[PDB]
C-alpha cells in the first residue's frame, strides 16, 4: 500500500508547499511523500555517436577514444553556457548543486569525483577534465576500468557513476558489433529554472543536431527512496527511440543513493526529480582515429572478467 514514482508535466511545474496543508485531501492523487522541494533535479545529456565509413583498420581503443575526446569540449560548453537574454539566472553557477568535499575515508576517489564546485559528472572526470592528460594517457581502457571491481557489488561503480549509462551500452564488447561507446553528462540542480533548462537544451541541439529524433520530453519523474532496516560494413546508425528516454530506469537500484552518499547527502526521507533527457549526436570519422593512432596500440592492461 504505497507508490514509489510520481510523474508531473513540465508545462507548469512548481514544488509542492512544505506545510500549507496540515492534512492532504483524502482523494488527492499526489503521494504522501510528495510534500517538500526535491533534494536535487537530475539532468542527463545522452551522447550517442557512430562511425559512418567503418573499416577493418579501426581498433577497440578508438571506440572509446573518439567519443570521449568530445566529452571535454561538451563539458566545457555546458559549464560556460549562459542565457544571453535572461530575466532571472544566467549561468550554471547560480543553479547547480554545490558540493564541498567527499566523506573522509573516500580519499581513494579524490581527483576522480568533483569537489569544491558544481556536481558535474562526465567520463572526463577520469582525467580531471584535462584533454592534455586524456591525449597523453597510453591506456584509456585501463584508466576507465582501473577501479572496476572483479565481482558484483551493491554499490554502483565509479565507471557507472561517471558514465551515467547502463553497462551494456558501453564496454569493449561494442567493437565486435561495430557500435560505439555512449555516455551521459549528468547535471545536478539544486534549483529549477525552465528558461535556463530550455536554453541549455536548445544550445546543445544547435551545436549537435540529432537526426530522426522525436523524443517526447513532456513530464518530470519523481523518485522516492525508502528507509532500509535489517537489524558492406554497415555500421549501425544513431537511432533514437522510446528506450533512450527513461534510461535511468535501467541503472542499478543503488545508483543515486551511492552518488549522493559520497557528499554526505541523504535520500532516506526525501525524493529527487529526474528531468527529461537532452539528446546529443556526434558524427565521427575513421581518419581521425587513424591519424591519432598511438604506440602501445592494441595491448591494454585489462581483460573482461571471467572471460
Amino acid at each position, epitope marked *: 500500500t504505497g507508490p514509489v514514482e510520481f510523474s508531473t508535466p513540465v508545462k507548469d511545474y512548481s514544488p509542492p508547499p512544505v506545510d500549507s496543508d496540515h492534512k492532504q485531501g483524502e482523494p488527492s492523487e499526489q503521494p504522501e511523500w510528495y510534500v517538500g522541494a526535491p533534494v536535487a533535479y537530475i539532468q542527463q545529456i545522452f551522447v550517442k555517436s557512430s562511425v559512418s565509413p567503418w573499416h577493418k583498420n579501426l581498433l577497440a581503443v578508438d571506440v572509446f577514444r573518439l567519443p570521449l575526446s568530445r566529452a571535454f569540449q561538451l563539458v566545457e560548453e555546458i559549464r560556460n553556457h549562459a*542565457l*544571453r*537574454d535572461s*530575466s*532571472g539566472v544566467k549561468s550554471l553557477e547560480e543553479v547547480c548543486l554545490q558540493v564541498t568535499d567527499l566523506l573522509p575515508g573516500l580519499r581513494k576517489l579524490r581527483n576522480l569525483l568533483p569537489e569544491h564546485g558544481c556536481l558535474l559528472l562526465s567520463p572526463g572526470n577520469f582525467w580531471q577534465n584535462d584533454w592534455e592528460r586524456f591525449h597523453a594517457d597510453p591506456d584509456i581502457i585501463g584508466t576507465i576500468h582501473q577501479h572496476e571491481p572483479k565481482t558484483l557489488q551493491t554499490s554502483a561503480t565509479l565507471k557507472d557513476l561517471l558514465f551515467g549509462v547502463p553497462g551494456k551500452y558501453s564496454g569493449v564488447s561494442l567493437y565486435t558489433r561495430k557500435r560505439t561507446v555512449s555516455y551521459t553528462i549528468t547535471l545536478v540542480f539544486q534549483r529549477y529554472d525552465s*528558461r535556463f533548462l*530550455s*536554453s541549455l537544451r*536548445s*544550445r546543445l541541439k*544547435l551545436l549537435h543536431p540529432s537526426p530522426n529524433c522525436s523524443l517526447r520530453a513532456e513530464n518530470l519523474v519523481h523518485v522516492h527512496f525508502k528507509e532500509e532496516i535489517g537489524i558492406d560494413s554497415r555500421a549501425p546508425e544513431v537511432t533514437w527511440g522510446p528506450e533512450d528516454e527513461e534510461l535511468w530506469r535501467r541503472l542499478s537500484f543503488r545508483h543515486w543513493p551511492t552518488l549522493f552518499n559520497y557528499y554526505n547527502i541523504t535520500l532516506a526521507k526525501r525524493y529527487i526529480s529526474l528531468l527529461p533527457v537532452i539528446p546529443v549526436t556526434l558524427r565521427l570519422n575513421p581518419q581521425e582515429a587513424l591519424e591519432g593512432r598511438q604506440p602501445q596500440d592494441g595491448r591494454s592492461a585489462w581483460a573482461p572478467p571471467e572471460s
Partner: antibody, heavy 120, light 108 residues
Framework: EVQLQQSGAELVRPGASVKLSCTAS????????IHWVKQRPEQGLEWIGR????????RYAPKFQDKATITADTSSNTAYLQLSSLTSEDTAVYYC?????????????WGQGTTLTVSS | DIQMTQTTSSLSASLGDRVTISCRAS??????LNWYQQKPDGTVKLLIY???RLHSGVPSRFSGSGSGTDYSLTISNLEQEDIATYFC?????????FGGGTKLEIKR
C-alpha cells in the same frame, strides 16, 4: 494558429504620450517574451526592448531608456508599449513579436505593425 | 554594438534565376544570424535562423551559409512571390541589431 493582433494607426501631437497595444492569440504571453521593433523608411529596423510577462522584468536598448516603457497583462493576454515625449523622429511602424527558442533568439511570429505619426 | 551591413541595398534579378544576399558583421557573431522577409504588404516573416536552419513551413528554396563575420542567403530559383526586402539579424550580443535590408527587383 499563433497570431499577434496589434492596434490601429495613431496621429498624436508632439510632446504627448502614446500607448500602443499588442493582443496575442493562440498562446499565453506567460510562456514567451514580447518584443517591440521600430522600423523607419530610411533607417532600417531597430530593437526597442522586451518584457517577461511571467515576471515583469524588462530591458531596453540604451537608445530607448528614456523613451519607451513596456508593460504586459496576463489576464487580457495583451502587451503594451508606451512612448513618452513624442518627437518628429519617433514616427515609424512598430512591430510586436516574440521568440520561443531561447538560444537562437529568433523572432518567429510578427504582428502587422502600427503606423505612428507625429505632427503639429 | 554590432553593426550589420548589407552592401547591395537593391539587387536586380529575374524569375527562375538564383539570388544571393550577403551581409557582413562588425565582429564575429558565432553563426547567430537570422534572416527575415518583409513583403511589400508590410508583413514580416522569418526564413532562416541560427545560420542555416529553415523555420517550419519555409519553402526549401531558401538556404543560408556563412561563418565568422560573413554570411549569405541564397534562393535556388526566384519565384514571383519571393520579391520582398530581406533583413539579417545578429543575436550574439544582447542589443540585437538588424541589417539595412535588400530589395529584390525584376530584370528589365
Amino acid at each position: 494558429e499563433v497570431q499577434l493582433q496589434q492596434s490601429g494607426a495613431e496621429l498624436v501631437r508632439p510632446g504627448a504620450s502614446v500607448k500602443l497595444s499588442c493582443t496575442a492569440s493562440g498562446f499565453k504571453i506567460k510562456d514567451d517574451y514580447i518584443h517591440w521593433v521600430k522600423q523607419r523608411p530610411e533607417q532600417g529596423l531597430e530593437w526597442i526592448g522586451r518584457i517577461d510577462p511571467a515576471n515583469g522584468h524588462t530591458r531596453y536598448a540604451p537608445k530607448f531608456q528614456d523613451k519607451a516603457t513596456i508593460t504586459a497583462d496576463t489576464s487580457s493576454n495583451t502587451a503594451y508599449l508606451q512612448l513618452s515625449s513624442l518627437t518628429s523622429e519617433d514616427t515609424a511602424v512598430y512591430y510586436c513579436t516574440r521568440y520561443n527558442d531561447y538560444d537562437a533568439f529568433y523572432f518567429d511570429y510578427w504582428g502587422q505593425g502600427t503606423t505612428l505619426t507625429v505632427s503639429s | 554594438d554590432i553593426q550589420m551591413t548589407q552592401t547591395t541595398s537593391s539587387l536586380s534579378a529575374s524569375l527562375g534565376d538564383r539570388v544571393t544576399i550577403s551581409c557582413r558583421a562588425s565582429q564575429d557573431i558565432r553563426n547567430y544570424l537570422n534572416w527575415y522577409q518583409q513583403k511589400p504588404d508590410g508583413t514580416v516573416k522569418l526564413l532562416i535562423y541560427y545560420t542555416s536552419r529553415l523555420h517550419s513551413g519555409v519553402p526549401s528554396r531558401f538556404s543560408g551559409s556563412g561563418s565568422g563575420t560573413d554570411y549569405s542567403l541564397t534562393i535556388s530559383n526566384l519565384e514571383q512571390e519571393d520579391i520582398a526586402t530581406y533583413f539579417c539579424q545578429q543575436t550574439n550580443t544582447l542589443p540585437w541589431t538588424f541589417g539595412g535590408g535588400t530589395k529584390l527587383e525584376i530584370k528589365r
